[PDB]
């Protein structure tokens, strides 16, 4: 009644690669404070994953932008659905730890 994942798959799926990552818009647009956003977060393919080597780190290499429809709701005064843009990671990579 139980399931196992083979090691080849574990290494493969948890590697450095763009993953759909849910990101709260607050983290991305911190200056529009006097505006609550509905939904509060957006799905963005961001970087992530093990490089399995100290020298290297999961860094983005190809980046682009997706504009999505978001309800900018002023807290109690009025709302409007505006096209706020966000950054996404097309491609990531494992590159040395510059230091």
């Amino acid at each position, epitope marked *: 009644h139980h399931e196992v994942v083979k090691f*080849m*798959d574990v*290494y*493969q799926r948890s*590697y450095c*690669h763009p993953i759909e990552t849910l990101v709260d818009i607050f983290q991305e647009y911190p200056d529009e404070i006097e505006y609550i956003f509905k939904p509060s977060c957006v799905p963005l393919m961001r970087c992530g994953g093990c490089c399995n080597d100290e020298g290297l780190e999961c860094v983005p*290499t190809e980046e682009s932008n997706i504009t999505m429809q978001i309800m900018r709701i002023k807290p109690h005064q009025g709302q409007h659905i505006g096209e706020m843009s966000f950054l996404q990671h097309n*491609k990531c990579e494992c*590159r*040395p730890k510059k230091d």
Partner: antibody
Framework: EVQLVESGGGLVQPGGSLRLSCAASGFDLWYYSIHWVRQAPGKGLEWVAYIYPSYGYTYYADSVKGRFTISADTSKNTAYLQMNSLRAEDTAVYYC?????????????WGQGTLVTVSS | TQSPSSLSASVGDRVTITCRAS?????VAWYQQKPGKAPKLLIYKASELYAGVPSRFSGSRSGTDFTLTISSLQPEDFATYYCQQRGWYLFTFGQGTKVEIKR
């Protein structure tokens, strides 16, 4: 365990079309990488193209760009290299291979070899 | 590029092929091309060794010049050897090295 099986090879007159098939065993294409590498007559290897299913990556070499298209059918565990404008230079043995991240940037389990001849 | 173009040593003679990288962060591979057959890989990540590959096989990295090393050359290892320079968006194969053997 892991096996790659190729098909679609044959003869095609200059200008014609043909689809290669690369079926995979013990190993899902979705979380992995399938490349087509052609070895021209008596010459070295040549990376034709790749597809990275879970990433949406379809990069082809410039010689076949536009002429060829790599693709994959998840249900049949199978990659396809649809060639549409086969010219003389396309004559080659076409290999399909897996690129697993555990082996870094590299083609582990390889295909068997399917021969494509562009002649009228 | 690859070097040597061709070489004839005997059994046991240490033999080393060298590959140039005019580089891409030391992501290199080594493959063995038996007579008209499927290229099998021997070295990945430019120093790691594929499963089954003999202990006599080895890799090294001189900055931008990666080499393949066979210590006790055994007769089975007659092939053409290739290096994979790799690249996320710029994969490029090595020149190839004929592994000749004087009898």
């Amino acid at each position: 365990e892991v096996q790659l099986v190729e098909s679609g090879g044959g003869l095609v007159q200059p200008g014609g079309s043909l689809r290669l098939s690369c079926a995979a065993s013990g190993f899902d294409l979705w979380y992995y990488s399938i490349h087509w590498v052609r070895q021209a007559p008596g010459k070295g290897l040549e990376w034709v193209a790749y597809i990275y299913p879970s990433y949406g990556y379809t990069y082809y070499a410039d010689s076949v760009k536009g002429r060829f298209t790599i693709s994959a059918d998840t249900s049949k565990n199978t990659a396809y290299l649809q060639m549409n404008s086969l010219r003389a230079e396309d004559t080659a043995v076409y290999y399909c291979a897996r690129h697993a991240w555990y082996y870094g940037w590299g083609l582990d389990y390889w295909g068997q070899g399917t021969l494509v001849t562009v002649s009228s | 590029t690859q070097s040597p173009s061709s070489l004839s040593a005997s059994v046991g003679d240490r033999v080393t092929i060298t590959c140039r990288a005019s580089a891409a962060y030391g992501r290199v591979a080594w493959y063995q091309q038996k007579p008209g057959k499927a290229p099998k890989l021997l070295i990945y990540k430019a120093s790691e060794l594929y499963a089954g590959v003999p202990s006599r096989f080895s890799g090294s990295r001189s900055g931008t010049d990666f080499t393949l090393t066979i210590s006790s050359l055994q007769p089975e290892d007659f092939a053409t050897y290739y290096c994979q320079q790799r690249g996320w968006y710029l994969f490029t194969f090595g020149q190839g090295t004929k592994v000749e053997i004087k009898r």
